[PDB]
Design a protein around this motif. Structure first.
Motif, PDB file in Angstrom:
ATOM      1  N   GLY A  54     -10.911  -2.929  -2.779  1.00 29.53           N
ATOM      2  CA  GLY A  54     -10.820  -3.518  -2.279  1.00 29.53           C
ATOM      3  C   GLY A  54      -9.218  -3.428  -1.417  1.00 29.53           C
ATOM      4  N   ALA A  55      -9.231  -3.497  -0.008  1.00 30.42           N
ATOM      5  CA  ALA A  55      -7.728  -2.407   0.219  1.00 30.42           C
ATOM      6  C   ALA A  55      -8.165  -2.630   2.156  1.00 30.42           C
ATOM      7  CB  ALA A  55      -7.411  -1.041   0.088  1.00 30.42           C
ATOM      8  N   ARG A  56      -6.715  -3.292   1.777  1.00 31.23           N
ATOM      9  CA  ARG A  56      -6.985  -3.322   4.174  1.00 31.23           C
ATOM     10  C   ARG A  56      -6.070  -2.089   4.577  1.00 31.23           C
ATOM     11  NH1 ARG A  56      -2.812  -6.882   4.627  1.00 31.23           N
ATOM     12  NH2 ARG A  56      -3.681  -8.593   5.124  1.00 31.23           N
ATOM     13  N   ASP A  57      -6.568  -0.982   4.716  1.00 33.72           N
ATOM     14  CA  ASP A  57      -7.118  -0.191   6.214  1.00 33.72           C
ATOM     15  C   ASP A  57      -5.608   0.333   6.138  1.00 33.72           C
ATOM     16  OD1 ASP A  57      -6.316   2.444   7.023  1.00 33.72           O
ATOM     17  OD2 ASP A  57      -8.271   2.494   7.696  1.00 33.72           O
ATOM     18  N   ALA A  58      -4.807   1.119   6.360  1.00 38.52           N
ATOM     19  CA  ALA A  58      -3.025   0.458   7.408  1.00 38.52           C
ATOM     20  C   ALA A  58      -3.377   1.270   8.787  1.00 38.52           C
ATOM     21  CB  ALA A  58      -1.923   1.705   7.181  1.00 38.52           C
ATOM     22  N   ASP A  59      -3.718   2.423   8.710  1.00 39.75           N
ATOM     23  CA  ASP A  59      -4.846   2.531   9.883  1.00 39.75           C
ATOM     24  C   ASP A  59      -5.822   1.688  11.274  1.00 39.75           C
ATOM     25  OD1 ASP A  59      -3.642   5.206   9.175  1.00 39.75           O
ATOM     26  OD2 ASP A  59      -5.260   5.528   8.908  1.00 39.75           O
ATOM     27  N   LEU A  78     -12.715  -7.917 -10.681  1.00 40.78           N
ATOM     28  CA  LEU A  78     -11.541  -8.014  -9.108  1.00 40.78           C
ATOM     29  C   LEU A  78     -10.306  -8.414  -9.849  1.00 40.78           C
ATOM     30  CD1 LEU A  78     -11.275  -7.120  -5.887  1.00 40.78           C
ATOM     31  CD2 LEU A  78     -12.190  -9.485  -5.500  1.00 40.78           C
ATOM     32  N   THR A  79      -8.791  -7.841  -9.320  1.00 39.58           N
ATOM     33  CA  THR A  79      -7.564  -8.018 -10.036  1.00 39.58           C
ATOM     34  C   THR A  79      -6.983  -8.889  -8.821  1.00 39.58           C
ATOM     35  OG1 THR A  79      -7.394  -5.933 -11.160  1.00 39.58           O
ATOM     36  CG2 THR A  79      -5.390  -7.804 -10.581  1.00 39.58           C
ATOM     37  N   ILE A  80      -6.375 -10.059  -9.031  1.00 37.99           N
ATOM     38  CA  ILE A  80      -6.397 -10.649  -8.547  1.00 37.99           C
ATOM     39  C   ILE A  80      -4.254 -10.976  -7.916  1.00 37.99           C
ATOM     40  CG2 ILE A  80      -5.160 -13.536  -8.610  1.00 37.99           C
ATOM     41  CD1 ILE A  80      -7.633 -14.602 -10.600  1.00 37.99           C
ATOM     42  N   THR A  81      -4.175 -10.048  -7.032  1.00 34.38           N
ATOM     43  CA  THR A  81      -2.883  -9.999  -6.124  1.00 34.38           C
ATOM     44  C   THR A  81      -2.665 -11.145  -4.926  1.00 34.38           C
ATOM     45  OG1 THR A  81      -4.007  -8.402  -4.394  1.00 34.38           O
ATOM     46  CG2 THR A  81      -3.655  -7.804  -6.388  1.00 34.38           C
ATOM     47  N   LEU A  82      -1.386 -10.801  -4.749  1.00 34.04           N
ATOM     48  CA  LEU A  82      -0.471 -11.827  -4.382  1.00 34.04           C
ATOM     49  C   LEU A  82      -1.885 -11.292  -2.601  1.00 34.04           C
ATOM     50  CD1 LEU A  82       1.075 -13.965  -2.690  1.00 34.04           C
ATOM     51  CD2 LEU A  82       2.512 -11.178  -1.850  1.00 34.04           C
ATOM     52  N   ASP A 101      -7.786   6.250  -7.432  1.00 31.43           N
ATOM     53  CA  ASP A 101      -7.025   6.709  -6.061  1.00 31.43           C
ATOM     54  C   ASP A 101      -6.847   5.739  -4.762  1.00 31.43           C
ATOM     55  OD1 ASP A 101      -5.817   8.300  -3.472  1.00 31.43           O
ATOM     56  OD2 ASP A 101      -8.061   9.468  -3.951  1.00 31.43           O
ATOM     57  N   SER A 102      -7.547   4.349  -5.565  1.00 32.21           N
ATOM     58  CA  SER A 102      -7.586   3.052  -4.323  1.00 32.21           C
ATOM     59  C   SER A 102      -7.225   1.810  -5.635  1.00 32.21           C
ATOM     60  CB  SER A 102      -8.850   2.890  -3.555  1.00 32.21           C
ATOM     61  OG  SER A 102      -8.463   1.700  -2.853  1.00 32.21           O
ATOM     62  N   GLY A 103      -6.669   0.854  -4.816  1.00 28.38           N
ATOM     63  CA  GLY A 103      -7.113   0.019  -6.436  1.00 28.38           C
ATOM     64  C   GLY A 103      -5.531  -0.824  -6.773  1.00 28.38           C
ATOM     65  N   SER A 104      -5.818  -2.325  -7.533  1.00 29.71           N
ATOM     66  CA  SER A 104      -4.711  -2.712  -7.386  1.00 29.71           C
ATOM     67  C   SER A 104      -4.053  -1.789  -8.060  1.00 29.71           C
ATOM     68  CB  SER A 104      -4.709  -3.750  -8.111  1.00 29.71           C
ATOM     69  OG  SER A 104      -5.158  -3.945  -9.176  1.00 29.71           O
ATOM     70  N   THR A 105      -3.900  -0.807  -9.285  1.00 23.93           N
ATOM     71  CA  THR A 105      -3.216  -0.376 -10.094  1.00 23.93           C
ATOM     72  C   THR A 105      -2.333   0.668  -9.491  1.00 23.93           C
ATOM     73  OG1 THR A 105      -4.842  -0.144 -12.233  1.00 23.93           O
ATOM     74  CG2 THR A 105      -3.348   1.342 -11.574  1.00 23.93           C
ATOM     75  N   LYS A 106      -2.598   1.334  -8.557  1.00 23.02           N
ATOM     76  CA  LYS A 106      -1.978   2.712  -7.672  1.00 23.02           C
ATOM     77  C   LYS A 106      -0.753   1.661  -6.616  1.00 23.02           C
ATOM     78  CE  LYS A 106      -2.773   6.047  -4.136  1.00 23.02           C
ATOM     79  NZ  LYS A 106      -3.387   6.904  -2.984  1.00 23.02           N
ATOM     80  N   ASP A 119       2.038  -4.648 -16.889  1.00 22.25           N
ATOM     81  CA  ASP A 119       1.865  -6.122 -16.252  1.00 22.25           C
ATOM     82  C   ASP A 119       1.328  -6.679 -16.592  1.00 22.25           C
ATOM     83  OD1 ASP A 119      -0.373  -5.103 -15.051  1.00 22.25           O
ATOM     84  OD2 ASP A 119       0.455  -4.951 -13.321  1.00 22.25           O
ATOM     85  N   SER A 120       1.269  -7.876 -16.079  1.00 27.56           N
ATOM     86  CA  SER A 120      -0.101  -9.212 -16.997  1.00 27.56           C
ATOM     87  C   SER A 120      -0.198  -9.697 -15.291  1.00 27.56           C
ATOM     88  CB  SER A 120       0.783 -10.626 -17.667  1.00 27.56           C
ATOM     89  OG  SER A 120       1.661  -9.409 -18.591  1.00 27.56           O
ATOM     90  N   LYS A 121      -2.034  -9.196 -15.630  1.00 22.10           N
ATOM     91  CA  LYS A 121      -2.276 -10.072 -14.047  1.00 22.10           C
ATOM     92  C   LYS A 121      -3.819 -10.877 -15.020  1.00 22.10           C
ATOM     93  CE  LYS A 121      -2.462  -5.580 -12.811  1.00 22.10           C
ATOM     94  NZ  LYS A 121      -1.880  -4.835 -11.504  1.00 22.10           N
ATOM     95  N   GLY A 122      -5.289 -11.093 -14.083  1.00 21.40           N
ATOM     96  CA  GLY A 122      -6.179 -11.576 -14.274  1.00 21.40           C
ATOM     97  C   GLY A 122      -6.876 -11.403 -13.134  1.00 21.40           C
ATOM     98  N   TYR A 123      -8.440 -11.596 -13.907  1.00 21.13           N
ATOM     99  CA  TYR A 123     -10.157 -10.385 -12.688  1.00 21.13           C
ATOM    100  C   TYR A 123      -9.968 -12.637 -12.142  1.00 21.13           C
ATOM    101  CZ  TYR A 123      -9.956  -6.028 -14.769  1.00 21.13           C
ATOM    102  OH  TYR A 123      -9.905  -4.818 -15.467  1.00 21.13           O
ATOM    103  N   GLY A 124     -10.662 -12.509 -11.550  1.00 20.53           N
ATOM    104  CA  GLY A 124     -11.366 -14.097 -10.557  1.00 20.53           C
ATOM    105  C   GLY A 124     -12.470 -13.772  -9.493  1.00 20.53           C
ATOM    106  N   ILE A 125     -12.770 -14.974 -10.549  1.00 16.42           N
ATOM    107  CA  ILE A 125     -14.366 -14.859  -9.267  1.00 16.42           C
ATOM    108  C   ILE A 125     -13.982 -15.209  -8.324  1.00 16.42           C
ATOM    109  CG2 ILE A 125     -16.196 -16.484  -9.060  1.00 16.42           C
ATOM    110  CD1 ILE A 125     -16.158 -14.259 -11.345  1.00 16.42           C
ATOM    111  N   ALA A 126     -14.232 -14.311  -6.796  1.00 16.37           N
ATOM    112  CA  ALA A 126     -13.253 -14.406  -5.406  1.00 16.37           C
ATOM    113  C   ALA A 126     -14.392 -14.318  -4.224  1.00 16.37           C
ATOM    114  CB  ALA A 126     -13.162 -12.954  -5.077  1.00 16.37           C
ATOM    115  N   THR A 127     -14.028 -15.840  -3.311  1.00  9.49           N
ATOM    116  CA  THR A 127     -14.866 -16.381  -2.469  1.00  9.49           C
ATOM    117  C   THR A 127     -14.198 -15.739  -0.990  1.00  9.49           C
ATOM    118  OG1 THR A 127     -13.832 -18.612  -3.139  1.00  9.49           O
ATOM    119  CG2 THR A 127     -15.989 -17.862  -3.897  1.00  9.49           C
ATOM    120  N   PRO A 128     -14.878 -16.360   0.228  1.00  7.41           N
ATOM    121  CA  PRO A 128     -14.517 -16.071   0.983  1.00  7.41           C
ATOM    122  C   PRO A 128     -12.789 -17.573   1.310  1.00  7.41           C
ATOM    123  CG  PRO A 128     -16.392 -15.631   1.358  1.00  7.41           C
ATOM    124  CD  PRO A 128     -16.861 -16.472  -0.095  1.00  7.41           C
ATOM    125  N   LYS A 129     -12.104 -16.897   2.266  1.00  7.87           N
ATOM    126  CA  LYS A 129     -11.063 -18.259   2.299  1.00  7.87           C
ATOM    127  C   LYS A 129     -11.666 -18.838   2.791  1.00  7.87           C
ATOM    128  CE  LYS A 129      -7.380 -17.332   1.452  1.00  7.87           C
ATOM    129  NZ  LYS A 129      -7.167 -17.331   0.324  1.00  7.87           N
TER     130      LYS A 129
END
Ligand SMILES: CC(C)(C)c1snc([O-])c1C[C@H]([NH3+])C(=O)O
Ligand SMILES: CC(C)(C)c1snc([O-])c1C[C@H]([NH3+])C(=O)O
Lengths: 258, 258
Positions: free
Chosen positions: A59-64, A87-91, A136-141, A213-223
């Motif tokens: 999951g990534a938001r295309d800039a274009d 799926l990594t929990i990111t801001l 090539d895509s993801g939270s690490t990159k 760094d330190s983080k975690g995976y979370g179960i995701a649902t629609p906002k």
């Protein structure tokens, strides 16, 4: 009414069972997240359908086009009801989808072929002989791309300019690259995956140094999904019962090869 | 100066060799198109690099973003110099990229599990018990979508409205679906692929009836590429020498399992 679960083929979280062509629906898959999904469904009392994300992305938001891709996009655009995967929990993602408390903790780490003279991120950043990259895509990159930490900024500057590309499409490609590079390539990925590969034959790779760094995976649902609350409580219950630890031991160590 | 070849993993045109993780570059692949590419390169006198298209698509112009995807997009946007794969020559694509004369002829055909009471497209269109579909993207789907032929229009109306979806992401999924549906699913794909599967164990599928249309695969290059002329002459020479027929026999029949 049947919960649509979006996930991704990523060993050992979700994998195709041997001779799967002869199997149907959810029975075609196996792994840590397949087991987790079953436990969550059992605890929340719902039926579900496992589906592999179309573009094979996290999951990534295309800039274009500004269009979210991967599992995050599946949730954002209402194609799936829940995402059960590493799926990594990111801001950035937390702003568009909901995440349960972490069901697994991890951090970006360094994977090297045994014998490689590298023990930290600073070491990698201070030399050029050993190449290094990420998915090539993801939270690490994304972490490296957005980081202002001196060492990581230096690492990112190198990675985005490196030619040939230091990025790979899949974890499998990153691993193969580490292995076939005779110690000339180091792979940056999340710790639990690094630990998993460490247990795969030919047992020639290893996690070196501490995490970046330190983080975690979370179960995701629609906002705003009503399913979010119950799923979060299930993750907490499962964690407290020791089920989460049992699953890791089962897929990482019980089935270890080293 | 090294020709970048975009192709796609589609048995038996391009496949990963057994235990490929231990192989490098072009040596990782094998198949009809891998052999063809080598012959063309040998005849045109150039070195090349085989690359698998990122999105695993053949090529379609998105209505929404108007952006060409797949191998066609790779050529259109200048990411690859030539496409060597089972890429169908169509009017729409011919307008944005160049194609050599056909290196293989084929037509849309019907794949059924042995025993299925279907022998033609008209039969499928006149009943509902046996479901039928195509690759979720590609020239076959596009043919039905654009067709004004009475029978095909009726078939398209059904397919685009069918629920659950009658479309599949890959040929492998289409085949598995035919096999696991106990004769309740018929798959529409190109004839040479239908013939290929017919030779794969468990030998429970078969091509039935005549083809729905006639067309061919061509080697593609960017519109106006100097490489186009030479590649076209090579295809003609290879055809006249009987090399193209030798390759089909090699990958379809010599390695047949039925
Ligand atoms: C595939 C795996 C989950 C191990 C890795 S390793 N580095 C990453 O960025 C990822 C993807 C990340 N978790 C995400 O959710 O984007
Ligand atoms: C994958 C395979 C080449 C057999 C098939 S079967 N039906 C199709 O549309 C295709 C793709 C088509 N040739 C194309 O070039 O789009």
């Amino acid at each position: 009414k049947t919960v649509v679960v979006t996930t991704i083929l990523e060993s050992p979280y979700v994998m195709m069972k041997k001779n799967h062509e002869m199997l149907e629906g959810n029975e075609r898959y196996e792994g840590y997240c397949v087991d987790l999904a079953a436990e969550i469904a059992k605890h929340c009392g719902f039926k579900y359908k496992l589906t592999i994300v179309g573009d094979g992305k996290y999951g990534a938001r295309d800039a274009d086009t500004k269009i979210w891709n991967g599992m995050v996009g599946e949730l954002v655009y209402g194609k799936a009801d829940i995402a059960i995967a590493p799926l990594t929990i990111t801001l950035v993602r937390e702003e568009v989808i909901d995440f349960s408390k972490p069901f697994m903790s991890l951090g970006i780490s360094i994977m090297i072929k045994k014998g490689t003279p590298i023990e930290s991120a600073e070491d990698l950043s201070k030399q050029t002989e050993i190449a290094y990259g990420t998915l090539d895509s993801g939270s690490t990159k994304e972490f490296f791309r957005r980081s202002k930490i001196a060492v990581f900024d230096k690492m990112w500057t190198y990675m985005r300019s490196a030619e040939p590309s230091v990025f790979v499409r899949t974890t499998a490609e990153g691993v193969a690259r580490v292995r076939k590079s005779k110690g000339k390539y180091a792979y940056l990925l999340e710790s639990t995956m690094n630990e998993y590969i460490e247990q795969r034959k030919p047992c020639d790779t290893m996690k070196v140094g501490g995490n970046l760094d330190s983080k975690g995976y979370g179960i995701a649902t629609p906002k705003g999904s009503s399913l979010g609350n119950a799923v979060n409580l299930a993750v907490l219950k499962l964690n407290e019962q020791g089920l989460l630890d049992k699953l890791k031991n089962k897929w990482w160590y019980d089935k270890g090869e080293c």
